[PDB]
Design a protein around this nucleic acid. Structure first.
Ligand SMILES: [Mg+2]
Lengths: 443, 232, 43, 86, 76, 166, 58, 45, 122
DNA sequence: TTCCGAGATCAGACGAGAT
DNA sequence: GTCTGATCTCGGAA
């Protein structure tokens, strides 16, 4: 997963600094490594490594635990570092589900890492009042009201109890009264909630508008009683479905009951195992639609129908000519979508065999496209890394000839086209990574 | 045949010749007789160093046809070796300054080193001082033939000529015949009399022989040539 | 394996064309000319 | 000989292409925050500085940088709305 | 001070090795020589007169060293 | 001007074994580092002292003597706070050329900052009026090797007043 | 062949200056060479450097 | 010198030793006894 | 030829000039034509360099003055770079210290600047 | 119940140099 | 055309 590590080098470089990236990315490359061993292998002085790990434990990227030697081996979790890419999307759904106050709550909780209640409410009392009218001061009591209102739906969970090992020092991590207790954001709750938007958009854009809302109210009343490791949601009765409907609807119980047995019986199938398994194939199909036209996408859906029945029917079952079809198979083979010939049983003969049958394997085509999408955002940021250092002469002139200004508006058209496009490929990551996490046992 | 076992370790070597050997007891154990035609070809780059300036001037007038001579001159700064056959040698003799290289012929007193090609022990390569004799055979003293395991029944053995002055001393000191008289298996001497000399000196030291001052001064005065001519 | 070998012995110093350290290349030689770590000038 | 002409092509053009800047309307909201926090993450306390510049500078001299209403009321509530583990 | 005070045959070879090549590049000769034109024959005249401007740097194999002047050694 | 501590492996050829090393290294090191700008360092001039000279090896090839030499050499490197005194050895319409006296004619002042009577109009007009002083302002050196100048300066002239000469 | 296998393992040993015999990698094979540190070449008959009867009569 | 009942003694013995093979041809273990004065007792051993 | 220490400046113009004056007159004692086919760039830099330093009337400048001026300088609180400018520039008149001199802002006071003219003249 | 012993098959190599 | 250790498959047992 080298392209994954390419992003963690890119994500820390833009956010904090360079040595916090370097000591950071080395720890991703060599793992459970002590404090002196990290400073000797990266060639970094020990005073800067203590600072760089201090920022890294604050934003919860490096976790420390000692087992046997009495010497703490730091360890960085890889998949947390890529969640910085989703950071402005984590802001936005707290604006759709909470006000501007609580949206700023998850913001400075994502920004400054570990926060106590006594600090984060004091900070938003500065930012929200300075943008509101002076003399019309925003009262902080409503912040404490919406602060717990996030926590009752469990969007913010507290930090695990600190080990307080001798090697670890308490004074350095806090940045400089009451002590309180710290927390990060519960971004795992978001990955339910981002999946809640994913299934409700999967039904509404396929079945009907009224079908999706009963999926939403099913999932909105199954939030605390499940977790992300739940194979499917908690089972509900249809009578509390009629109780939990929104007030915008007026549908009679028996007609929605017909839609309830309609929605329960589909090819799609609430089976949370089958939901992410069906949404991932549409993400695959939207990539071949993006890349190889509707004709090759037509045979790409054909192998998702029959598992191992190929090349004696695919020239027939899509009616496209043998010349035009077989270049689409080998292009789906060479780009690892078509997977392979796992049926040949004649012994050691490419020429004489029982005829190789194509078969898509959904996860090998998944893990590649996730590795491809990790590679994709490397080419996005590095371009925005490229176009920045040249144009610095004219950013401060506003703070100017006609080609001088024209380079700026072609820059600002470019960066805003790049930065918007970092997020549109980001929604493909989570839609596929949640499918990856759903088929992974013992993790 | 590959590059490891035959091109990186066992690689072919310039300044090296090969003839048939024939005996010569009239040399010291440390000297090989080198033919003239070979000694005019194998050359030693002797740099000019205030002590061989008149000696190299004297031999560069001879050029590559008379034996104590030379056939290449580099100038002091990587000028191409000047094949000393076409031009004026005396104009190259007078213009010869310090520092530059003369590739003089294999002269007597130079250090060549033998090898008999099935090398089985340390003693198959040995250095030898080189005296330019008049023939095309490599002639050495027959005491040093059991280290080479070399009989004279049509056997050939190679003669390398070390070029740098550091590799000339490493031949003379380490690999000279006066140093390696003794094999490193036992400590026994390998260079000692073979065949006729043993049956010569047995028949001489046998109890029955008696020489008068006729034959006594004749046998004794055989031992007076070549570093031995100046002793009473 | 990422095998970093140093170049020692004789089967590698002959291949690389380094003077081998076995035998005459064990030690090294200095020169005995007139030298000393001298005093500097006052600045 | 059929391909022995030049590098295949400088680039290979795919007749079908990318759709658009997909999800056009709503990522105006996230897209400014992409640039908003990056304006504030770089200008934060949680960053490092190039002290290798200052050890590189032997030209240190004076007169250069190299040389040089929260309206709120008290309360205290500590909630265990969160997990009791780890 | 701990190694052998005898000049080995590998030290006599290289001292004669490089004092020959030094004197074949017009080095100053220390023995007021008597017509020897072979630079190697000058160097053995330098050794027997014990005038060679060379100090042998003897490496103990741990990495420590021990110097030895060629004046300060017992040749054979 | 500034001292620069440098370390070099100086090879004395074996026909100089009569002379003392610390002199005969110094004759080599002047031929190695004179009139040569070192990148990010400045214009070396000559040898100040040899602060530490360590032991003369002699390698298996050359037969020469290679002494690793620690030394100090004086170099030319303005400190971005120096008011120098040079001479105008040239006038270009984009900016004047000043030269320090027989030192280096490679200091090229851009001219935008003196009093609003500034132009060089190709008939060698120095300045439209109201030894020459100079303020060296930036360090700027470009490493030359690029395929199979180099300390140029930018030089200013603020409102000094220049009481003696305008 | 047996000459070749022998010398392709045994070539990189030399008696170092503190009388130890080490490999090329620094590892010690012998602490003194052969117990006494004596040349077999210079060694006298009976594996003894002197053979004292001969030297005393000499 | 390599160039120069049954037990192997030649070069195929020295080649057999240098290889240090696990199984050799003609391996022989000699053994001294406690009572080495009578053929009947060593018969019994 | 790696440079270990990039900087270490206290070489006042007199120091460098003096070193060059001893060097120029000392190199000619051993001046060589053997090395002409090799190196001659050294001669040019030293020769011309002497003249630019000579421009400053370090002719009649003395070694003791360096400490004597320095003893006065330490009281003023000017930085080491500033003092080197003060010795090397050798401001002839008040206007250079008054205006040309570095760190004029604040520290001028029209007090020690007047005193400096007496010290610089000395 | 698994694991280690003993049955098959597989490797790279088999001196210098010379015309 | 064998001589070779390595590395794979079978099988009987605490
Ligand atoms: Mg024969």
């Amino acid at each position: 997963t080298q392209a994954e590590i390419k992003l963690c080098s890119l994500l820390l470089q833009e956010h904090f600094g360079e040595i916090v990236e370097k000591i950071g990315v080395h720890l991703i490359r060599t793992g459970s490594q002590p404090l002196r061993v990290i400073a000797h292998d990266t060639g970094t002085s020990l005073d800067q490594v203590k600072k760089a790990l201090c920022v890294l434990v604050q934003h919860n990227l490096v976790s420390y635990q000692v087992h046997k030697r009495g010497v703490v081996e730091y360890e960085a979790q890889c998949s947390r570092v890529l969640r910085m890419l989703r950071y402005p999307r984590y802001i936005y759904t707290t604006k759709t589900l909470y006000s501007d106050t609580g949206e700023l709550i998850v913001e400075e909780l994502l920004l400054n890492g570990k926060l106590t209640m006594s600090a984060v409410v004091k900070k938003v009392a500065d930012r929200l009042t300075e943008t509101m009218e002076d003399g019309k001061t925003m009262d902080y009591a409503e912040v404490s009201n919406t602060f717990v209102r996030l926590a009752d739906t469990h969007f913010v969970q507290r930090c695990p109890s600190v080990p307080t090992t001798e090697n670890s020092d308490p004074g350095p991590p806090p940045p400089a009264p009451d002590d309180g207790i710290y927390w990060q954001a519960n971004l795992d709750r978001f990955h339910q909630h981002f999946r809640d938007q994913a299934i409700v958009s999967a039904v509404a854009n396929r079945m009907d508008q009224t079908s999706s809302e009963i999926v939403r109210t099913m999932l909105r009343m199954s939030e605390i009683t499940t977790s992300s490791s739940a194979p499917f949601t908690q089972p509900l009765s249809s009578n509390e479905i009629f109780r939990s409907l929104p007030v915008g609807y007026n549908i009679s119980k028996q007609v929605l009951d017909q839609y309830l047995t309609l929605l329960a019986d589909d090819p799609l199938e609430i089976n949370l195992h089958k939901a992410l398994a069906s949404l991932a194939t549409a993400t695959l199909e939207s990539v071949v639609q993006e890349r190889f036209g509707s004709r090759c996408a037509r045979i790409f859906r054909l192998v998702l129908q029959k598992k191992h029945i190929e090349q004696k029917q695919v020239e027939d079952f899509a009616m496209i000519p043998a010349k035009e079809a077989k270049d689409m198979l080998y292009k789906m083979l060479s780009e690892n979508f078509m997977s392979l010939q796992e049926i040949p049983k004649t012994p050691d003969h490419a020429p004489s065999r029982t005829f190789y049958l194509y078969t898509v394997n959904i996860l090998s085509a998944a893990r590649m496209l996730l590795h491809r999408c990790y590679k994709s955002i490397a080419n996005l940021i590095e371009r925005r890394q490229f176009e920045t250092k040249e144009n610095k002469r004219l950013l401060e002139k506003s703070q100017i000839t006609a080609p001088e200004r024209q380079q700026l508006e072609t820059l600002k058209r470019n960066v805003n086209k790049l930065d918007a496009s970092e997020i549109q490929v980001d929604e493909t990551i989570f839609l596929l990574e949640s499918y990856i996490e759903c088929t992974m046992k013992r993790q | 045949q590959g590059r490891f076992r035959g091109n990186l370790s066992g690689k072919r070597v310039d300044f090296s010749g090969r003839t048939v050997i024939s005996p010569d007891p009239n040399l010291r154990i440390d000297e090989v007789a080198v033919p003239v035609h070979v000694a005019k070809i194998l050359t030693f780059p002797e740099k000019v160093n205030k002590a061989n300036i008149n000696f190299l001037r004297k031999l560069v007038q001879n050029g590559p046809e008379v034996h104590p001579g030379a056939n290449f001159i580099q100038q002091r700064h990587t000028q191409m070796k000047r094949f000393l056959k076409y031009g004026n040698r005396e104009k190259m003799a007078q213009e010869l300054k310090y520092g530059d290289i003369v590739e003089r012929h294999l002269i007597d007193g130079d250090v060549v080193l033998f090898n008999r090609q099935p090398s089985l022990h340390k003693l198959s390569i040995m250095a030898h001082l080189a005296r330019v004799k008049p023939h095309r055979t490599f002639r050495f003293n027959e005491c040093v033939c059991t280290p080479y395991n070399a009989d004279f029944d049509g056997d050939e053995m190679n003669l390398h000529l070390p070029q740098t002055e550091e590799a000339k001393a490493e031949a003379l000191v380490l690999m000279g015949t006066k140093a390696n008289l003794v094999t490193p298996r036992n400590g026994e001497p390998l260079i000692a009399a073979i065949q006729d000399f043993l049956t010569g000196a047995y028949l001489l030291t046998l109890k029955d022989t008696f020489f008068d001052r006729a034959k006594a001064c004749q046998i004794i005065a055989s031992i007076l040539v070549g570093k031995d001519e100046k002793i009473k | 394996f990422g095998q970093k070998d140093s170049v020692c012995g004789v089967s590698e110093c002959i291949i690389m064309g380094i003077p081998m350290n076995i035998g005459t290349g064990l030690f090294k030689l200095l020169h005995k000319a007139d030298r000393d770590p001298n005093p500097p000038k006052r600045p | 000989f059929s391909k022995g002409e030049k590098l295949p092509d400088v680039v290979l053009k795919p007749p079908p292409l990318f759709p658009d800047t997909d999800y056009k309307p709503v990522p105006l909201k996230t897209g400014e925050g992409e640039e908003y926090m990056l304006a504030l993450k770089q200008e934060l306390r949680e960053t490092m500085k190039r002290m290798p510049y200052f050890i590189e500078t032997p030209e240190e001299r004076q007169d250069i940088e190299r040389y040089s209403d929260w309206r709120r009321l008290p309360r205290e509530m500590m909630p265990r709305n969160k997990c009791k583990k780890a | 001070r701990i190694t052998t005070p005898y000049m080995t045959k590998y030290e006599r070879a290289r001292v004669l090795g490089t004092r020959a090549l030094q004197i074949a590049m017009c080095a100053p000769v220390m023995v007021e020589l008597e017509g020897e034109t072979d630079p190697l024959l000058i160097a053995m005249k330098e050794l027997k007169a014990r005038k060679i401007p060379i100090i042998i740097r003897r490496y103990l194999p741990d990495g420590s060293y021990e110097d030895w002047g060629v004046d300060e050694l017992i040749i054979t | 001007f500034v001292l620069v501590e440098m370390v070099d492996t100086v090879r004395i050829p074996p026909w100089q074994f009569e002379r003392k090393l610390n002199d005969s290294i110094a004759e080599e090191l002047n031929k190695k580092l004179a009139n040569k700008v070192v990148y990010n360092v400045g214009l070396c001039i000559c040898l100040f002292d040899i602060t530490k000279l360590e032991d003369a090896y002699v390698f298996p090839g050359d037969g020469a003597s290679h002494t690793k030499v620690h030394f100090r050499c004086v170099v030319f490197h303005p400190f971005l706070d120096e008011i120098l005194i040079g001479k105008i050895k040239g006038c270009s319409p984009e900016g004047v050329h000043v030269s320090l006296g027989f030192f280096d004619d490679i200091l090229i002042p851009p001219e935008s900052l003196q009093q609003p009577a500034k132009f060089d109009e190709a008939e060698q007009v120095w300045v439209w009026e109201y030894g020459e002083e100079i303020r060296f302002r930036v360090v700027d050196e470009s490493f030359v090797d690029t395929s199979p100048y180099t300390l140029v300066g930018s030089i200013s002239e603020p409102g000094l007043g220049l009481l003696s000469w305008w | 062949y047996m000459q070749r296998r022998l010398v392709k393992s045994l070539e990189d040993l030399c008696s170092q200056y503190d009388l130890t015999v080490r490999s090329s990698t620094g590892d010690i094979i012998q602490f003194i060479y052969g117990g006494d540190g004596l040349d077999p070449a210079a060694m006298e008959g009976k594996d003894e450097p002197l053979e004292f009867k001969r030297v005393l009569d000499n | 010198p390599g160039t120069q009942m049954n037990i192997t003694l030649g070069v195929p013995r020295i080649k057999e030793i240098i290889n240090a093979s696990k199984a050799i041809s003609t391996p022989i273990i000699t053994a001294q006894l406690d009572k080495d004065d009578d053929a009947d007792y060593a018969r019994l051993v | 030829m790696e440079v270990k220490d990039a900087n270490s400046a206290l070489l006042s113009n007199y120091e460098v000039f003096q070193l060059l004056t001893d060097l120029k007159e000392q190199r000619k004692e051993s001046g060589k034509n053997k090395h002409s086919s090799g190196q001659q760039n050294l001669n040019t830099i030293t020769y011309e360099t002497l003249k630019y330093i000579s421009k400053t009337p370090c002719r009649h400048q003395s070694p003791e003055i360096v400490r004597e001026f320095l003893t006065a300088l330490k009281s003023h609180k000017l930085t080491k770079a500033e003092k080197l400018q003060l010795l090397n520039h050798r401001p002839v008149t008040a206007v250079e210290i008054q205006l040309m001199v570095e760190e004029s802002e604040e520290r001028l006071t029209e007090e020690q600047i007047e005193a400096l003219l007496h010290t610089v003249t000395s």
